[PDB]
């Protein structure tokens, strides 16, 4: 049972400008995930000092990098707070109405688009590389959920009937053709000590048969 959504149209122009502009510096999608994760693995750390049970569902706090040649993706995992439905369908989690409004003004008063994170849309920057993203999420308060869109103007949600997941947010990246890069353990390595080197998160990088 799918259920599809319109997005607002503010996000779809955010994405069609992500997808359509020349724009070479697409590895920041990476930091920008990276950062969403470690944000989310703040939230969940900070219920957990006032209420241990909250992380009955996974003690362990840390982000991994899945890449899969045979399949084409890359996987960002993350044990943090996770998404209910209801923060799935508005934006995973985000302000991105009036955060990709700031955005926009920026990149015609000077900005590129690096910049995006600081707008708390940043993880819209994943269609620099992917053709088509799914996000699995499971929240304590709610079931395991599968989000996705290949842009042109909708996404769909489900109920997820894969592996469960205990807590947290996987990012499936279904990378595009002539990205194949970031599936590079050596690319990948220098990404995230370029611009991840301070996150206070263990990032483990899986290695390939």
Do not use: C
Request: charged share 25%; glycine share 8%.
């Amino acid at each position: 049972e799918v259920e599809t959504f319109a997005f607002q149209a503010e996000i779809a122009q955010l994405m069609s400008l992500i997808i359509n502009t020349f724009y070479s510096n697409k590895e920041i999608f990476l930091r920008e995930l990276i950062s969403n994760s470690s944000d989310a693995l703040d939230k969940i750390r900070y219920e957990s000092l006032t209420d241990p049970s909250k992380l009955d569902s996974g003690k362990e706090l840390h982000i991994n990098l899945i890449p899969n040649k045979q399949d084409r993706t890359l996987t960002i995992v993350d044990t943090g707070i996770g998404m209910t439905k209801a923060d799935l369908i508005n934006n995973l989690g985000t302000i991105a109405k009036s955060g990709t409004k700031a955005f926009m003004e920026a990149l015609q008063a000077g900005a590129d688009i690096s910049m995006i994170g600081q707008f708390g849309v940043g993880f819209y920057s994943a269609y620099l590389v992917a053709e088509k993203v799914t996000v699995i999420t499971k929240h304590n308060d709610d079931e395991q959920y599968a989000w996705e869109s290949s842009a042109g103007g909708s996404f769909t949600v489900r109920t997820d009937t894969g592996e469960p997941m205990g807590r947290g947010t996987k990012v499936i990246l279904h990378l595009k053709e002539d990205q194949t890069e970031y599936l590079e353990e050596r690319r990948i390595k220098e990404i995230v000590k370029k611009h991840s080197q301070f996150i206070g998160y263990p990032i483990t990088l899986f290695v390939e048969k």
